[PDB]
User: Which sequence fits this backbone?
């Protein structure tokens, strides 16, 4: 639930006097809707009717794309990733 | 024939639109939109209810609609036969630019030509991997 | 704010701000570059800060070329399952 | 045959989904699979790294082919034969000729023994005769011999040979030229007709020509996506 930037402050009170200190903390670029895919197994012959099993939330409708790899190697991929999308998310937090 | 002189040039301007919003300077956009507006006002019939039908001398066929929800898009068609002897017909209303385009490839009878040419390179086989010391030279002349 | 009881009540006032915004939208392609004439196939989604599938109205989508000629257009769509797939047959005779 | 592998969407049944998909006999090289999911309760989901699948035969031929060319020009098609199978066996090739081109060998049509991991090749000096689509069909087959470089040349079974078909395109030879004509036809709620005359010169390369018609209108192009951004309160220096 924590964005890669976390703002933690600890404080207490001394009668008329307060104290507080805060720091931002680094979190990994992780989401919640875990998902896991598996072909079983790899490097075979042209084994048609091959299976790809995947695990995710019990209620969901979602999508898939399997493509070549030479383009992957040659051209600068657009980083279609949670990293990029969260970065594109605006108003993640406010300075002041 | 302002339309003749004007459709293509308006189209060039439109195609060289800028998605930035405005253009490289101001004066350009100013005078541009001036002329665009004046073009529109001497033009801009509101409705463009339209249908078109292409034929040949012996029965080519193509019927295309044209409405607002269609007007934003360009329409196209290749041509099947050799030499263009066609016809076009239109019902409805609207100002449409139509374009005919032909491409071909011409040889020259190389055996007896009026041009002399000679192309060459510094190296011919690399074999150092690639000996990148590579300039390309050419010598040409015209006789006729 | 104001806090009241048998001991004492104190009232104070400050200012805040409220912000109506949209949902982040994005397109997943199949491949970076293609063969000419084929079907460019892609998916469009959009969710806001909830990041949970929430339905929005795909207002309008279109394609643009170096000529600026709109060639793939669809208007007033909606996410049946938080996503909509569109495809378009390219032109074989295409200059890059 | 070969541009992608899969592109679709499925829902979930309490575990995910075990999608079954066929495998293309064009198992050239590795395959990258990535996907996405959404759930009305806990959100969206992506991969750590794409599932990268692979498949091929220990022994086959890869081809080295160019992009495209013109008919009269010659080239040199090439193809590696590659072995991963342990045994060192003699192999030969089969080619299908066609009139759309001409082929000249390099005068060494030698079946040869390749060991595990080994590779050889052969090439063909090709000119063209047709134009446009071009395809080439070949096959790598195992040769049987008992007194070989090392023992009997094993033959596996019936599917000891594989066939490959690959296509490119070839272009017209000389210098290309384009011409066009235009007509802004504006009709006031009626019918208007116009014949079309398109005559071409004589010495043109055969079949080179191709014609096509475009239908646009103008001025209505982008007067809307431009307005929303060309207005703002002016602030800064006076000239700007």
Assistant:
């Amino acid at each position: 639930d924590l964005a890669p930037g976390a703002e933690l402050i600890v404080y207490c009170i001394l009668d008329l006097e307060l104290i507080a200190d805060t720091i931002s903390l680094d979190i990994e670029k992780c989401f919640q809707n875990q998902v896991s895919l598996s072909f079983s197994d790899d490097l075979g012959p042209t084994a048609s009717n091959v299976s790809l099993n995947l695990s995710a939330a019990p209620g969901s409708l979602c999508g898939v794309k399997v493509i070549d790899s030479s383009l992957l190697l040659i051209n600068p991929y657009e980083s279609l990733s949670a990293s990029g999308v969260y970065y594109s998310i605006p108003y993640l937090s406010l300075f002041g | 024939d302002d339309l003749t002189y004007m459709a293509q040039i308006s189209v060039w301007l439109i195609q060289q639109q800028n998605s930035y919003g405005g253009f490289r300077s101001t004066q350009d956009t100013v005078v541009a939109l001036q002329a665009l507006a004046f073009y529109a006002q001497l033009l801009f019939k509101s409705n463009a209810h339209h249908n078109v039908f292409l034929r040949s001398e012996y029965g080519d066929v193509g019927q295309l609609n044209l409405s607002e929800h269609n007007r934003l898009v360009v329409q196209r068609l290749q041509l099947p036969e050799v030499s263009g002897n066609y016809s076009i017909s239109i019902n409805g209303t609207g100002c449409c630019l139509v374009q005919s385009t032909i491409r071909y490839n011409i040889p020259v009878p190389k055996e007896n030509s009026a041009f002399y040419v000679a192309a060459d390179s510094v190296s011919k086989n690399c074999l150092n991997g690639v000996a990148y010391t590579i300039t390309i030279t050419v010598s040409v002349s015209y006789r006729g | 704010l104001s806090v009241s009881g048998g001991g004492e009540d104190i009232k104070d006032r400050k200012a805040v701000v409220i912000a109506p915004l949209n949902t982040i939208c994005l397109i997943q392609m199949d491949k970076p570059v293609y063969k000419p004439g084929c079907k460019v196939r892609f998916r469009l989604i959009s969710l806001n800060t909830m990041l949970l599938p929430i339905s929005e109205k795909y207002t309008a989508v279109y394609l643009e070329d170096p000529s600026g000629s709109r060639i793939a257009q669809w208007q007033n769509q909606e996410s049946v399952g938080g996503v909509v797939q569109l495809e378009f047959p390219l032109i074989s005779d295409a200059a890059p | 045959f070969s541009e992608t592998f899969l592109w679709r969407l499925v829902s979930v049944d309490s575990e995910g989904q075990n999608t079954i998909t066929e495998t293309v006999p064009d198992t050239i090289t590795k395959w990258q699979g990535s996907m996405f999911c959404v759930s009305e309760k806990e959100g969206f989901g992506i991969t750590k790294y794409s599932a990268n699948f692979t498949s091929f035969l220990p022994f086959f031929v890869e081809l080295s082919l160019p992009y495209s060319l013109t008919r009269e020009e010659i080239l040199v098609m090439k193809a590696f034969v590659s072995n991963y199978l342990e045994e060192c066996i003699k192999i030969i090739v089969t080619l299908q000729p066609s009139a759309d081109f001409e082929v000249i060998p390099q005068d060494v049509k030698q079946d040869q023994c390749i060991c595990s991991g080994g590779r050889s090749s052969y090439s063909w000096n090709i000119i063209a005769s047709s134009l446009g689509r071009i395809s080439f069909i070949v096959s790598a087959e195992t040769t049987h011999i008992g007194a070989s470089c090392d023992g009997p040349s094993d033959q596996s079974q019936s599917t000891r040979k594989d066939t490959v078909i690959q296509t490119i395109l070839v272009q017209p030879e000389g210098i290309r030229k384009e011409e066009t004509s235009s007509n802004l036809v504006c009709v006031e709620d009626s019918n208007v007709e116009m014949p079309i005359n398109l005559t071409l010169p004589e010495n043109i390369v055969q079949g080179s020509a191709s014609a096509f018609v475009t239908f646009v209108g103008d001025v209505l192009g982008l007067p809307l996506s431009n307005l929303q951004n060309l207005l703002q309160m002016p602030y800064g220096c006076g000239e700007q």
Remarks:
- Chain D is about 0% helix and 50% strand.
- The CA atoms of residues 79 and 122 of chain D lie 6 Å apart.
